[PDB]
Amino acid sequence: GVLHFVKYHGLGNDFILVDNRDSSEPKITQEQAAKLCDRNFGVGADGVIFAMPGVNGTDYAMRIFNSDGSEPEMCGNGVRCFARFIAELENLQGKHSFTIHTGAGLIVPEIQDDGQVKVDMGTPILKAQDVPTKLSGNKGEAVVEAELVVDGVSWNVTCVSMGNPHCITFGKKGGPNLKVDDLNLPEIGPKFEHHEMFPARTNTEFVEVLSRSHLKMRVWERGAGATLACGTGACALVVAAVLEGRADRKCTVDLPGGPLEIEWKQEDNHIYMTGPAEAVFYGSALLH
Amino acid sequence: GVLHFVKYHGLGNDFILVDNRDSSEPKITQEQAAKLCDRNFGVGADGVIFAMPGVNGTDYAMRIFNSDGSEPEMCGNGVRCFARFIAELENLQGKHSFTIHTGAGLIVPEIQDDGQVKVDMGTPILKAQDVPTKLSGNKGEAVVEAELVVDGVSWNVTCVSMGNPHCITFGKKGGPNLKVDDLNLPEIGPKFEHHEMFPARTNTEFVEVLSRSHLKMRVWERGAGATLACGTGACALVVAAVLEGRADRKCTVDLPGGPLEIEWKQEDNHIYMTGPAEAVFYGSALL
Amino acid sequence: GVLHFVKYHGLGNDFILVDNRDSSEPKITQEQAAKLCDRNFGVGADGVIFAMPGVNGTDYAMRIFNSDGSEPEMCGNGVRCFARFIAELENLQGKHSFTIHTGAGLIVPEIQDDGQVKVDMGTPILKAQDVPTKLSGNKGEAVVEAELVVDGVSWNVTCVSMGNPHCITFGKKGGPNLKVDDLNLPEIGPKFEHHEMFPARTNTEFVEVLSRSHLKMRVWERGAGATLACGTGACALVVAAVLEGRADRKCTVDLPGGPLEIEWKQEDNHIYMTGPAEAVFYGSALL
Amino acid sequence: EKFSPASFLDKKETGVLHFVKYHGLGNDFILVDNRDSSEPKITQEQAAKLCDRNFGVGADGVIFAMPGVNGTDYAMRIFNSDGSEPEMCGNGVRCFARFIAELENLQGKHSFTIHTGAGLIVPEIQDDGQVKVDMGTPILKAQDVPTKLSGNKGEAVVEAELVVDGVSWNVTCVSMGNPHCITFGKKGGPNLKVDDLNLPEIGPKFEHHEMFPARTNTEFVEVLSRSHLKMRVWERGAGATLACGTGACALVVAAVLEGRADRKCTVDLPGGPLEIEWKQEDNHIYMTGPAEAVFYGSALL
Amino acid sequence: GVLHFVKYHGLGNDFILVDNRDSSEPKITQEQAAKLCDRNFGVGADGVIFAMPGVNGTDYAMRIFNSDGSEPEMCGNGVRCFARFIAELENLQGKHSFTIHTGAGLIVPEIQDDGQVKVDMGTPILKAQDVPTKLSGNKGEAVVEAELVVDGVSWNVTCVSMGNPHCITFGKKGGPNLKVDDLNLPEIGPKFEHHEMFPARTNTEFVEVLSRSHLKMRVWERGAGATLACGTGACALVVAAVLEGRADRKCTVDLPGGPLEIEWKQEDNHIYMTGPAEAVFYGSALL
Amino acid sequence: EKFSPASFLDKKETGVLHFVKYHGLGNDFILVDNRDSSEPKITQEQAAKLCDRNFGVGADGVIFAMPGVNGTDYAMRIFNSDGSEPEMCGNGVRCFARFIAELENLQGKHSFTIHTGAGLIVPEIQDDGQVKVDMGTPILKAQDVPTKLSGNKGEAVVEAELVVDGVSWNVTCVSMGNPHCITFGKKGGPNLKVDDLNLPEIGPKFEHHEMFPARTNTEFVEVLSRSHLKMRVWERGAGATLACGTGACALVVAAVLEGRADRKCTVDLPGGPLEIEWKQEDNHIYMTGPAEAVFYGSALL
Numbered sequence A: 001g002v003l004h005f006v007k008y009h010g011l012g013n014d015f016i017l018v019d020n021r022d023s024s025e026p027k028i029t030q031e032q033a034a035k036l037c038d039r040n041f042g043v044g045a046d047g048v049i050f051a052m053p054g055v056n057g058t059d060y061a062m063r064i065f066n067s068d069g070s071e072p073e074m075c076g077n078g079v080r081c082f083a084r085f086i087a088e089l090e091n092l093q094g095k096h097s098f099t100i101h102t103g104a105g106l107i108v109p110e111i112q113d114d115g116q117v118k119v120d121m122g123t124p125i126l127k128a129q130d131v132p133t134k135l136s137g138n139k140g141e142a143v144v145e146a147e148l149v150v151d152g153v154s155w156n157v158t159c160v161s162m163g164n165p166h167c168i169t170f171g172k173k174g175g176p177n178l179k180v181d182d183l184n185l186p187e188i189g190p191k192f193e194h195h196e197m198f199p200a201r202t203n204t205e206f207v208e209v210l211s212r213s214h215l216k217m218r219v220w221e222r223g224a225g226a227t228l229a230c231g232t233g234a235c236a237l238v239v240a241a242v243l244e245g246r247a248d249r250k251c252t253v254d255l256p257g258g259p260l261e262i263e264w265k266q267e268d269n270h271i272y273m274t275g276p277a278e279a280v281f282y283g284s285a286l287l288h
Numbered sequence B, C, E: 001g002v003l004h005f006v007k008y009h010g011l012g013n014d015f016i017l018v019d020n021r022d023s024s025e026p027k028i029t030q031e032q033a034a035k036l037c038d039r040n041f042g043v044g045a046d047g048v049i050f051a052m053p054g055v056n057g058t059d060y061a062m063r064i065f066n067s068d069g070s071e072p073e074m075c076g077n078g079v080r081c082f083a084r085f086i087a088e089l090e091n092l093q094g095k096h097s098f099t100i101h102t103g104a105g106l107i108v109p110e111i112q113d114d115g116q117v118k119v120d121m122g123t124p125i126l127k128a129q130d131v132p133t134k135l136s137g138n139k140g141e142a143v144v145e146a147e148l149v150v151d152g153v154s155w156n157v158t159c160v161s162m163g164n165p166h167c168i169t170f171g172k173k174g175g176p177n178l179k180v181d182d183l184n185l186p187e188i189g190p191k192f193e194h195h196e197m198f199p200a201r202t203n204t205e206f207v208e209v210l211s212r213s214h215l216k217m218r219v220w221e222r223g224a225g226a227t228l229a230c231g232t233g234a235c236a237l238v239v240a241a242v243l244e245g246r247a248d249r250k251c252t253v254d255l256p257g258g259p260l261e262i263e264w265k266q267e268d269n270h271i272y273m274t275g276p277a278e279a280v281f282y283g284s285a286l287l
Numbered sequence D, F: 001e002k003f004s005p006a007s008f009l010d011k012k013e014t015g016v017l018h019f020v021k022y023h024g025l026g027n028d029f030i031l032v033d034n035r036d037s038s039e040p041k042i043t044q045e046q047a048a049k050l051c052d053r054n055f056g057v058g059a060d061g062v063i064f065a066m067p068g069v070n071g072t073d074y075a076m077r078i079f080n081s082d083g084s085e086p087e088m089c090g091n092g093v094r095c096f097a098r099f100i101a102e103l104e105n106l107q108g109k110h111s112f113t114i115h116t117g118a119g120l121i122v123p124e125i126q127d128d129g130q131v132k133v134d135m136g137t138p139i140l141k142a143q144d145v146p147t148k149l150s151g152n153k154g155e156a157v158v159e160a161e162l163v164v165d166g167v168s169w170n171v172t173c174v175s176m177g178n179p180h181c182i183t184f185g186k187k188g189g190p191n192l193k194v195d196d197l198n199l200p201e202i203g204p205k206f207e208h209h210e211m212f213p214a215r216t217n218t219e220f221v222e223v224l225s226r227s228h229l230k231m232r233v234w235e236r237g238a239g240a241t242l243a244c245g246t247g248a249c250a251l252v253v254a255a256v257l258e259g260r261a262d263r264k265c266t267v268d269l270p271g272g273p274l275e276i277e278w279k280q281e282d283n284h285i286y287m288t289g290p291a292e293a294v295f296y297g298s299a300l301l
């Protein structure tokens, strides 16, 4: 078989985008996606994103498979690429917004004049059971700066879902601030990702506060590893920073691949994420 | 501002192959190749290989740019991919062989009946000055199991060129055999690659002898890092194993991505390398 | 005057496509179209197809003039060329579907991943006098494997309309299966085309069944002659094959210029046709 | 769909050819301005594809206007629709003259010298707009035509027997740079009614005959009067065309050699008439006929 | 810094076109534009035109700086160049039209089959104070063939705005028809351009009527001087010719650099201008 | 629309010229790297088109940096905006020097030897970035300027009568490879206020005068002091430019010969000042002035 696609990246978080507007079922299996995402034996990507037909009135729907083949419920860098991809297919020039049905609910990206995409990422989910996490809520049903014992070491974490689960930490329990570049993600990351307290596994964001409006982070993603950026993660860590009282609702988040502008609007409780999305190459891959 | 190409890999050492038969000048610059080889911002590859017009009578010529943009003189996994590419482009089925002009001289791949590609990789260069290395020859003009001080630690190395430079080590001076999987390549690799004793930098192969006909290795390549396989490297390390008296001329070399059959024939001093090569996808990249 | 156009072909059924989105009236007359279609004195084509403004909500409308100047009500190969032509004018990339108003009613082409076009050709018309044919229905209101006397010789034919009229035959009455390549179309074709039983003339398809899902055919088109392919004809002959019990609803139809995939869906009674369409050249003709 | 790196690379390697379409009595050609180079802009294989009437532009051939040679104003090279390269083309050189006149904004009478594979050819747009061409002198020596038939009238092959698929025909051979086999009928047979011939059937048997090493063009002739001939032609590499200028010149030479017609004749071809004159004064043949532009464009290669 | 641009001209009225689609803020200042427009010390042009993001729904917006640095509200020759610039940047083929927001309101250029551009230049503004001019309206609120004293000499003029102001004259009050080529524009032009009756200065068109459908003109433009052509000027002078009863609504206007086809439609009060636009070179200018 | 195969084929965007735009005191030029050949990359006709300010790139001329001749580092050829080829250009060679320094990434003081139609010219980039050029020696012999005026001071034409459109002017003739006609006023007339002259009117009468076989550049001079001259120029083939380096050199030579100024003068040109010195020690003339890059680009041909 043959899979036609277009390669895009949002701050280095790269994806295989496929036009699946003709069917409600993804053109390839999760197993095929995992093979295609292998960087040496396949096309190479952090995931495969499908542009599908709208659901209940939305312009389109989006489904995504992580490079390990699992299906997460949303992807911020990916939805910015999705908007640019649709624009290319439909010859839409300049500013345009679309309603997208996703596993996290309604998401509304709007292409900006400069080509970046400002996305309405919806509202954060903080109730422990729905994140989901087995940690007990310590601020209402929300888990904020709570103890998580990781391989015998006590860390403090805040849990938030953007449809997908995030475990955000600013450091160990009773410990100093983090210098995220000093962390050994391949070592510590998997211990959070597969922790027994996260039934569906979790994405993990390690954060260093530079100022109340400027945060630096590294992320170990569920099913994708140490990526250059994670949009849902940047949204979740700003929510966590606000809940822990370490930063304000509008921050610039520096991710390994570059910055994102995040704002958690108190007026509507929605989170807006603005960042770039760029097409890299067009192709056809051999399917097995 | 668009490059059409086909992606291939030889044991996981993956490349962007471009049909450059219509010109003597590579279609893209070394700087553009480095960008295209970036795995997250580009197409992603260990290098870009160009199929160019023959030279002085060869069927074709091959030029390659490492993912860092530098231009090495040969690539074994790459030439096996080159052979599949040509057969694809010329609709050649079954056994076929082509003469290819490279920076290492004449190279002759031959697609076998079983589909694998057996390549005549030329003869190894052992004279120290030509590898090139500033290390002094201790076995005739060759550098064999000689001391190399790496970040203050003494290692024993053997140097051989397959057009490109290789530094092969079976362990530290006065040290035990290596368990290559225990090495931290990102840490030790760059120290060999940019060592002052290698004027043009060097590829480095770490080897574990399993038997006199079976070697296991990991490699830190000049300009490409810790790749899954290196064909010139596998050829050079068998030459080194023979010179150090650790193995015979015919060996199976296990590389991270898989095995290669290597034979340094005493009959003609040529080294033959047999391995796979597979197309993965094709497309057009924005430049 | 000057007519600007783009030449396309669908399996060799070639057309002159003109951007007529500016007016509800075709830019040239039927007489001018016939002249332009002359292969040695004009541009050369089986027809001229106009991309016109939508009607009652459709994205566009399509009108076509045969190479003899007559105006048929639809064209399958032509609408596949139309879809690629419009995609170009709208700067669209990849898959796109369009609603097109035609003399056969709504037609919906959809560009596929491989550049091919799958078209919802609507539902077939089988009522005898609406085909139109003067032959009496012999199976319900339809004419199925009925006797047609052509120049004194009895043939059995099935009539179906895809907006335009089709007369399909699998052979003479009481005769063996056909070897379509042995037919002399220039001789027999005109006798069917202008037959008194077809008031508006008819397209004629001669069919050879290779299997229940594989049919071979040749066609003598109303106003265009022995073309390399006819999409409405391929659709009509599959309908005829099903009605005569000779084949399944899903078939590969081999036409002189190539194959088409046809499916007369039992679920909705719609017929889907998938085939290629390619641009050949851009031009300006003297009027 | 099949994964095919080969097909894919071909598709993205498409070129473009700008041209103007002309026809001389229905013998239609793709004219290209190649004055910028001594090498034809496209290959013979590409020309064959472009000449396909359903999958390409459609034509009996592709004609290139090239830079002059050893003096001449221009040079002309032509590829048949089958891709082969013939030495000359009469209807084509009349189209060539119009093409040049159009490109150089030349109005009224104008003559150009053209270098061809048949030697010097000199077309001249007439006051009345038609193009009268000095087609040079005919080649009659058998081995130079070329034909393996033995000269039977001096070194020329005139009304000689040619066994075609076991049937004896009488033919006359003459070259206008390109080879021509002219017949007025079968040996010991009646005059021909050319419209009754089945060219697709008989044509190929002459075209590829073993007696014509470089293949041949074949003209079937019906004499209407000593100054009026009717013909049909099966051309080497182009088939049953509507007209052939070198053919009309060759058949008048043949008619004169066989004593059937005068040196000044009106020749009726499927697409129309040509005025031909084989001047005894200088042995040159003059051909007068029309040429018209039809459309112009850019073809994908 | 550096400014990348493409040079175009519409009948010799030449401009520096810049791709400013990424921001509503022009890439350079008015002062920088004046410097770049200097023909000996800069790039040389009658103005700089920016292709910007759409506004309130239009496909794009256009802003222009005259060679003196002032910002006029529209430019007809420039919008034709703008349309070809977009087509080039987007590799659009065939007929395409775009909605453009300008200081004069909506303007809609459409690329024609022959490559010319036909533009819906909007509707003319005749109310004196909106032109703007301080002359009193003498035909309703419009100034038509009214006395304007220029440096002590009485001229009759008609004022119309196409977003930008235009003062059209067919001659002096009580004087004969003009032979525009005999005028000394560098001398008389500035006296109209900076006249006290034109608060925002004005463009001035001198017209010679050749027939009721054929007008010859020369223009002295506000902020650009004696240019080879002015599209808004050609539209305004046809409006003036109609108002003065000297010509019909559809005219060919001969400007120094060539002709424009102009039509002021009574059906909707819109004026359509058709003419050429050609790219000359592209470059990068030092800022 | 008219059917026009010719227009269609012309419109097929032939070639492209890469260049860099420079100006010396407003005398602006298109500089092209032509170091790979002794033949200019474009024709004189193409240069004239490119120099059109509204339809082309716009310039007073096109200057080619060519390969050295007889050991010089480089050679320079220039085409005026009217297409004619003059033998030297002072403002141009200063731009040429900076162009070279850019192509060779040369920093600081540098001098190159340039072969020109005027012979050897040697520009040197100063520390301040200005360029001081050794313009060679001036040619004063009447017939070598060339001019048909009789030498009235040795073999030189100094303050001699030239009847221009019936009016008597006094002029001095000097060549800097190219011809120059310098005037400080009419015969028996007062000093000039150069800004009051109507150059487009009087200029062409001198430029095409019968006494100048190869036409001539004309400099109108107003002496401000013995070391300060103001001028305007009407150049052969370029018109009223903002500055002319060879002209500034020639008018200082003329001022000295007529005894109106010293060998070292500041010359005020419309676009700015130039420092000129006619060294008595070697009879060489040195011109110092600026040169600036403006933009670079690619023009359609």
Ligand SMILES: C[C@](N)(CCC[C@H](N)C(=O)O)C(=O)O
Pocket (backbone or CB within 6 Å): A013, A066, A072, A073, A074, A075, A076, A077, A078, A164, A165, A203, A221, A222, A223, A224, A227, A229, A230, A231, A232, A233
């Ligand atoms: C694409 C993404 N990195 C999220 C990917 C999904 C994530 N790996 C998960 O398993 O939830 C983003 O939000 O930008």
Ligand SMILES: C[C@](N)(CCC[C@H](N)C(=O)O)C(=O)O
Pocket (backbone or CB within 6 Å): B013, B066, B072, B073, B074, B075, B076, B077, B078, B164, B165, B203, B221, B222, B223, B224, B227, B229, B230, B231, B232, B233
């Ligand atoms: C492609 C290759 N790994 C060699 C690549 C070139 C190598 N990185 C070098 O710089 O010499 C091989 O021999 O298989």
Ligand SMILES: C[C@](N)(CCC[C@H](N)C(=O)O)C(=O)O
Pocket (backbone or CB within 6 Å): C013, C047, C066, C071, C072, C073, C074, C075, C076, C077, C078, C164, C165, C203, C221, C222, C223, C224, C227, C229, C230, C231, C232, C233
């Ligand atoms: C273009 C077409 N061959 C139909 C052409 C119309 C046909 N000649 C007719 O007169 O009905 C098709 O259906 O593909």
Ligand SMILES: C[C@](N)(CCC[C@H](N)C(=O)O)C(=O)O
Pocket (backbone or CB within 6 Å): D027, D080, D086, D087, D088, D089, D090, D091, D092, D178, D179, D217, D235, D236, D237, D238, D241, D243, D244, D245, D246, D247
């Ligand atoms: C164009 C032409 N028909 C001749 C074409 C060349 C001919 N097919 C050949 O192969 O000799 C003519 O002479 O008019």
Ligand SMILES: C[C@](N)(CCC[C@H](N)C(=O)O)C(=O)O
Pocket (backbone or CB within 6 Å): E013, E047, E066, E072, E073, E074, E075, E076, E077, E078, E164, E165, E203, E221, E222, E223, E224, E227, E229, E230, E231, E232, E233
């Ligand atoms: C570019 C233009 N000449 C108008 C330029 C604007 C004019 N100089 C003004 O100041 O109004 C046109 O309308 O074609």
Ligand SMILES: C[C@](N)(CCC[C@H](N)C(=O)O)C(=O)O
Pocket (backbone or CB within 6 Å): F027, F080, F085, F086, F087, F088, F089, F090, F091, F092, F178, F179, F217, F235, F236, F237, F238, F241, F243, F244, F245, F246, F247
């Ligand atoms: C460029 C220049 N103005 C001279 C140009 C050549 C002059 N137009 C001539 O024809 O002699 C100079 O000397 O500076």
